[PDB]
Design a protein around this ligand. Structure first.
Ligand SMILES: O=C(NO)c1ccc(C(=O)NO)o1
Ligand code: NA
Ligand code: NA
Ligand SMILES: [Zn+2]
Ligand SMILES: [Zn+2]
Ligand SMILES: [Zn+2]
Ligand SMILES: [Zn+2]
Ligand SMILES: [Zn+2]
Ligand SMILES: [Zn+2]
Ligand SMILES: [Zn+2]
Ligand SMILES: [Zn+2]
Ligand SMILES: [Zn+2]
Ligand SMILES: [Zn+2]
Ligand SMILES: [Zn+2]
Ligand SMILES: [Zn+2]
Ligand SMILES: [Zn+2]
Ligand SMILES: [Zn+2]
Ligand SMILES: [Zn+2]
Ligand SMILES: [Zn+2]
Ligand SMILES: [Zn+2]
Lengths: 174, 174, 174, 174, 174, 174
């Protein structure tokens, strides 16, 4: 069918959207994994644990937002498997942060491509949606992972464990 | 003359804005008419009446801030007569819901054509204007009207006058 | 047909009422034009603009009120084209006020004939309706415009731009 | 490495918990899809949608509390892919209710086998865990889903389009 | 070294951003000069004075938000000397308002050029940055300075001492 | 011309004030530069940044009060180019503190010489103005910079990344 509400809504755009949803749920899955990793009795950095748990809940917010744009435009949601992440053990506070930064650069890439598509297919509505709710969020996050990584490294992580423990106290703990 | 504030504002943009002004005022007249049709002693659905008197007042807001925009950029407002609606009797609640859907998807086509003009003339201010204050509002508008229609249909409207009475109570009365 | 509520309601009154509705929308439209005219970067008298905009929203109430009385008496609303105002460029504050006084004297005329018709068709309900909700409002609005004209002319307008700028500050801006 | 906190926690229990974690995440995914299904403009039952969006967030909670449990006991979390749901179109609100029921009765069955496992490994902490935080919860949840289905049926669902609309109003909307 | 956070950030964009910073710091300097001009014992227009000083601090905000952006995107800040303003003596309130109009149109074109660049390099994050934090802020400033220049002109300035005094009180003084 | 307020205000003092104005504008630029350096994703010390950004704005205040003073005494302001800081990269937090220190003694130096000028020209208003608003402010700034440098060196700056991270937390974040 074609929904009564659909208008200037191209099907690459619609299919690009069902792709992002999955990517956002993917990242939500990664951050859950990082979170409970730093909750391990042998790692025990509670603020690393809550930092990523919060990112896990936000990625969820991202996907649900897109699931809403879809129906709003008259596209139809098709869901897919969520890949388990690439690790079971994230090694270190620094390394987990670097993986986070890598993950978000990559989600950012897809958002930019999704913007290009929306622009190329002359969807001003879809494109302002990406710029308003996603683009600058991803710059902020990526700037923030960058800063953390810079600070964990300058402090002598992940060699110095003292380093990671003070960072969990003094940066991720308000 | 050429206004002292004019900058990057193409006379084709100026004349498109004036067109949109008239179309918004037109919208408002349609809803005004729909509203006072449901206030007739033989239609007597008050929440339908309120729901359109509101959109009537909303569309008037839409025109008024196009008028501001026009002067903001140093163009010049020319008003044209306001066409009376297509109908005097709007038949039923479902139907008026189907009519407004049609109307808003139409006004939305105009906004997407105003915006593409803006893009092509390299007017980012005007394109952003359209994006923030109109596109998204139209997609929320289109999406809602669709929802009401689907519900009226599934309830058994327009035949069932029970359904329309109940939809007025449980859906448009808060 | 004939509405189950109609009573001592003559169809000339009904057609007289549809006419006034249009006329009120007309004035509503004239006052909008005046308003955004003084919002022009090359006119720029904010309080002239806010004054006429407020008159715009009141005429809209003036007309919705009449559309209410129509359905109330079981008459039936037929709308009509809203003719664009007789100017796009209202020249000055003095001249805008003078046009406005002309406009309302003319609308006052139409109401008085409507009262005459209501009286002549022995409709004391329609007659009290015009006495209560319109007649003294039209005397107040005519007197107010006259005083503004008197003051703007006594301040040496419209050749003294100083004149009109002080009037906008000291009379229309509280 | 064997965790410094592990005590009377059998590696069969550990692997049984990780299994439940995945099942709970999976249910969360099912409710998610059920939810934004009723957000489509052709379904348009907003309280069905709210009701399922909530259970999705609850099933998430279910998983998170299991991941805390694993680490509390000295086990090690291993996530796995999240299987997308069986349907992309859940047909009707009655049906989704019937599917949800089936789903919940399925997860209840897994926790009773986890419970029997715990008991047989003489793991009373893990049995008391399942007793307090899951068993009565699923039992309340199964009973409510039975109630809603029984009611949707008794009102004439899913054929009576009015029925589902009203259940969404009168039962799922407070 | 490429900054760790960089992504879709063009070296033209970065250098153009560095130019806009200088241009904003140059704006703030001009408005500073204008403000203490009116503070002179032989000009003595405190509201002109306070008007431009507020505008001076605004421009400094415009620059600092550009700088933060450079860092967010991984760009690199390079400052250059701040050109002293063109005049030491700004003649009068009218001429000062005119010169601000010229200044802000010049800033506005540089920013439209910066947006164009951003679009030419497929940097939607940058373009929507310029869109939402600068473009309509420049239109507002340009409209307001338009109105001010107009109202000063119609009053009789710069020939009428009275006019620049009363505009100081009744417009620049709230 | 000679100003109508001018009294016991020497041309050299008028000259030395104008130059002092420029030097405070310079100090504000330096501090602004140091601030956004510490905002870089590869330096990432938020409280060094806040510290220097607060300096930056205070120095602006220093200059505006000189501009105010100049007009009070009947002198005439002449603004010069504001030269860009010596550095684009400030290396480290300790080296930035040390360069702040060097700058503030240089500013102290010129302020003391401006005081000697005022004494020499028997200008006690000018002398007390300098004493009252700048002299102890300069001593306080230099004492605080001295202490910071001292602490940063004892902690092992600049070699110690940890030292600069802990100083940012425990001294500059309150
Ligand atoms: O044979 C049994 N069930 O069929 C059995 C043996 C021991 C238990 C028990 O309850 N342990 O706590 O149950
Ligand atoms: Na935009
Ligand atoms: Na009477
Ligand atoms: Zn995301
Ligand atoms: Zn993210
Ligand atoms: Zn500490
Ligand atoms: Zn509209
Ligand atoms: Zn609309
Ligand atoms: Zn384009
Ligand atoms: Zn009911
Ligand atoms: Zn009227
Ligand atoms: Zn009137
Ligand atoms: Zn006055
Ligand atoms: Zn569960
Ligand atoms: Zn459940
Ligand atoms: Zn600016
Ligand atoms: Zn500006
Ligand atoms: Zn200073
Ligand atoms: Zn200083
Ligand atoms: Zn002495």
């Amino acid at each position: 069918s074609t929904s009564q509400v659909r208008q200037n809504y191209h099907q690459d755009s619609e299919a690009a959207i069902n792709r992002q949803i999955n990517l956002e749920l993917y990242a939500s899955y990664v951050y859950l994994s990082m979170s409970y990793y730093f909750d391990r009795d042998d790692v025990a950095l509670k603020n690393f644990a809550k930092y990523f748990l919060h990112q896990s809940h936000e990625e969820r917010e991202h996907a649900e937002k897109l699931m809403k744009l879809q129906n709003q435009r008259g596209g139809r949601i098709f869901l897919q498997d969520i890949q388990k992440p690439d690790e079971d053990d994230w090694e270190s506070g620094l390394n987990a942060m670097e993986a986070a930064l890598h993950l978000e650069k990559n989600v950012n890439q897809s958002l930019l491509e999704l913007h290009k598509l929306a622009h190329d297919k002359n969807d001003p509505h879809l494109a302002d949606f990406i710029e308003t709710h996603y683009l600058n969020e991803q710059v902020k996050a990526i700037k923030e992972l960058g800063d953390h990584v810079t600070n964990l490294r300058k402090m002598g992580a992940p060699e110095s464990g003292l380093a990671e423990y003070l960072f969990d106290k003094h940066t991720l703990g308000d």
